[PDB]
Design a protein around this ligand. Structure first.
Ligand code: ASN
Ligand code: ASN
Ligand code: ASN
Ligand code: ASN
Lengths: 312, 326, 326, 312
């Protein structure tokens, strides 16, 4: 039976230490030797760069000691941690993230079977070499495209652009897809010696939007700003003016969208070359922030940033 | 054949590029007359009249165009049988809801856009506008609030949003579904919004020169509190949170918003999550902090309503009650 | 606390397997009392009473269970404040619509199922049933027709269907959306079905011992006409076509159905396509052949209505008019 | 510029010969040398085995004469032809199917740009080795999973289980996925010498369903029957009884579902080994019919049929 390490970070799946959780699902012993370590115990709305860094290091450092990783984490920023670990983890062994929408004590709590199926996925050899995974609602989702789609539904997690990698039925996975975008040990991002990441903020666009949020980030010397644009990554005029000024001033600018699916493209309404802006593609704003932070460890150059956004 | 007024505002529907097959295009360049004349069949369903109100990309929509549209619709109500408003897609969901809460005209107001410019191959704008006219002319379209018609579908202004960056099918009422489907110039209406709209709302914009100041702040891991603070220092009347999950906030964003709320800033919790209500009675004690839960309203839509709530009242429990009725 | 009657019929909600973590299970084995007692919190919201009506997999649902449910609900109307019906998922969409057209009780009838057996880990049945009771007890649930409650969502019997073979989230009203969302035992209703239901329909099953014979035939490339013919030779009163695309038929299926229609068999065009109306005025001249277009009704749902239409009339244009009002 | 062959079969995209169509889109000359041949001119509701066979042969025979194939076809059975060609085509060069929901003369007709983008996809070298494709509404969809989802919407075609392969913007495709299931020249199906296919019918399940359709197919000596089950491929009792009898009597039986997504699984309510039935997986009934017809050219054995359903 495979050796599987659970790294606990909190969330509503624990709404409680790694011990209790493991012990709540005695059927885990049917599929793996499960060992639990507590990294943190927080609601994922308070997820931060330091936790990210703790996790990337710990997985990379403990890779040879285990056959796989499950990370119990909150729902709220799961999609952001999944893609961070997707781009920084060097281990070629499965890393599977899982949470829950209802707590342990609620009617029809989703946590137990979620965990069961996260382990089935971490323990399956066919799960290797597909990047960092999220396993929720009987489904295996790549860490790049996965996002939460509904505020309360157990079925919230979806790969809303390119679809899931496979479905889990009766402790078995039929994989039919793997992400093409370069991930894990095919990426230049090496975070083993870093104690902090470049400062990247997100600003929202909408009608009559103020430029003040964007200005406060420029004023604070932020390394990057991600625009959550309207439509195909468009920007309200005040916001566009402030970011056209930040881009040439040592603040990288990534155009993403608040629209929940589809790529922000080049060649639409925004002359990106002319402003020194980067189009995020299908990366949603919080996702773009992950990749922007990590592109800034390698380079401050807009054109080389765009290339990274085109490859990872 | 009924009398329909097109109030044009721009958008990609009025967009042009130099090639039918390149994606590059510019917005707010083509006038209403060209739109009207690119749909030769409109004569069969209505006596159409265009007026260019502005000509912009909806990325640059703003309170003053809103005030201009509402007062214009309300003033001209008795000169026409219905309105179509051609408009960009990017903030269509915002304008549609603003109008849904402010038009007192009891004739259909139907917005419409296109995802491909008017120059492009298989441009979606021509049949979309045909279909917004059908809808505007249909007696059964009355008393449903303000509408958006795109891709053969009639959608209510409250729930409607854009779901994809390029897809002609982008416009969907993602929580409660469409009102009716359009086929052969006819509509099968199976729904009407329950929430109060139009002449059932207390909001009266007829003498308003401006709208209260409301900003939107985003939540994510390691979120800066600087955007929230910039809005607070500027004396904003309201702030909407685009929370994570069920309307949750990063600690530092939370702290800045709680303080603001004690000084009398209206603070609404919404969500960056694209479907589902930001609910009361979850991880935030709203009554403790003086916050308001947005319900199914996404952040840009909560802003519309919060701005309008702030013209009536500054009391958090009254703003809550408004966000439960409208 | 209101009085709620559970009428149990089986389903996976009443399903059991030998392991919590294997997928193998058997249906119609566990009685209503076990269901009720697996939701210890039901005492807080209603005085629940169970009656086992049958105990089957809904794969084996049939006209006689339909007639039994409708007459039972209609007879007992004044003994209770509402009904929950626990039922399999597989044909829930069919039973729900049959009831939606036949119940004359003006108290909520709410069906409910589960996608995992009651034995399984994180079984969905317990909270689903909790939530069908909330809904059945809610005054605002009245006058909406017959309902299905699953995965925190209240759905109308007409549009509701199962969209995935295993997903707990399978139940969706795919054309017109849900009626309301359930959170913390409360509902925000934003819609009601427009189509006529319950005490507004002419269908009266109270003295009926059986239902007219209606079969469903599938279309695909190279389709055999033998299924259509087997139904015609057996003297079926109606045949529903699960057409390709917008309700289109393979030539040989078409030919068999046209003939049947001239001899007085009712023939309804529906579609195997999972959303969108089978429309009039497309590639089939319905008036020419004496066929009826199903609208948004999928084939199994057109069957429900066709069977009921056939108790009133055999005239194709009257069957059309029924499929446009109900 | 690549050489691209358009094979015309009809449909509403031509609602008209291959000549007119090509000529309707003069911008085709920007991306390819386009040559058109007329195979048939029918509404795809009348698609049949003979057309399928004509197409598989013609593509396989003309492979070395061109750089790619676009097939203009009706919407109604596009998904069935795509998977047939997916499993029989031996050419390693792109085969792209396209149709339209509105005719040439309608407001905002979708045909012209649909065709434009089908050619962009047939002409792109990155499109090779992904199987038979369907390109509709700016999207590239694998032929196995693609299905029509709405009766009238231009956006009807979707890969509703595993998602699309890529999106087309400004004449370029960002591919992020490829089907894992074996296709084209990785399949044993060889149709070069066949003038007919095994007789396979489809029966529908629902409440109070008659066994007569199923019996009429057994009585006619059909090689296979596909059940469009309820839920996870369940069968009404009368239908179950008739098919339990056909399965041991020289009529292969495949359990599929009328439910528009998800796999029909083994290990649920139906003891498949015991009845000699095959679970279709994610193959919907009309799709299962394609694979069932072609599995019957190799074998009549239920257990070896199931294996093929597990691999292609
Ligand atoms: N269900 C959850 O996990 C929500 C919680 N706020 C978290 O993200 O930690
Ligand atoms: N499709 C569109 O109309 C997008 C455009 N930027 C607008 O909103 O004006
Ligand atoms: N999930 C379920 O309930 C499926 C079961 N076969 C039924 O419909 O009874
Ligand atoms: N739009 C279409 O292509 C429908 C037509 N009946 C066909 O499949 O040939």
């Amino acid at each position: 039976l495979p050796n599987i390490t659970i790294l606990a970070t909190g969330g509503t799946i624990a709404g409680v230490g790694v011990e209790n959780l493991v012990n709540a699902v005695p059927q885990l012993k049917d599929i793996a030797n499960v060992k639990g370590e507590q990294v943190v115990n927080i609601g994922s709305q308070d997820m931060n760069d330091n936790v990210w860094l703790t996790l990337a290091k710990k997985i990379n450092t403990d890779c040879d000691k285990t056959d796989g990783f499950v990370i119990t984490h909150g729902v709220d920023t799961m999609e952001e941690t999944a893609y961070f670990l997707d781009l920084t983890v060097k281990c070629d062994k499965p890393v599977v993230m899982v949470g829950a929408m209802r707590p342990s004590t609620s009617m029809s709590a989703d946590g137990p079977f979620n965990l069961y199926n996260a382990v089935v996925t971490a323990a399956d050899k066919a799960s290797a070499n597909r990047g960092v995974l999220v396993v929720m609602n009987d489904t295996v989702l790549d860490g790049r495209d996965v996002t939460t789609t509904n505020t309360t539904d157990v079925a919230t997690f979806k790969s809303v652009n390119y679809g899931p990698l496979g479905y889990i039925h009766n402790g078995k996975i039929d994989y039919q897809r793997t992400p093409a975008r370069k991930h894990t040990s095919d990426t230049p991002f090496d975070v083993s010696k870093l104690n902090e990441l470049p400062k990247v903020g997100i600003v929202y666009n909408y009608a009559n939007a103020s430029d003040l949020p964007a200005k406060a980030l420029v004023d604070a010397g932020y390394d990057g700003i991600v625009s959550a644009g309207v439509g195909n990554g468009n920007l309200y005029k005040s916001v566009f003016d402030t970011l056209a000024t930040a881009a040439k001033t040592g603040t990288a600018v990534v155009r993403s969208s608040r629209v929940p699916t589809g790529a922000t493209t080049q060649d639409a309404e925004v002359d990106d070359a002319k402003y020194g802006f980067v189009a995020s593609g299908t990366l949603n704003p919080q996702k773009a922030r992950v990749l922007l932070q990590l592109a800034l460890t390698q380079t401050k150059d807009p054109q080389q940033i765009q290339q990274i956004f085109n490859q990872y």
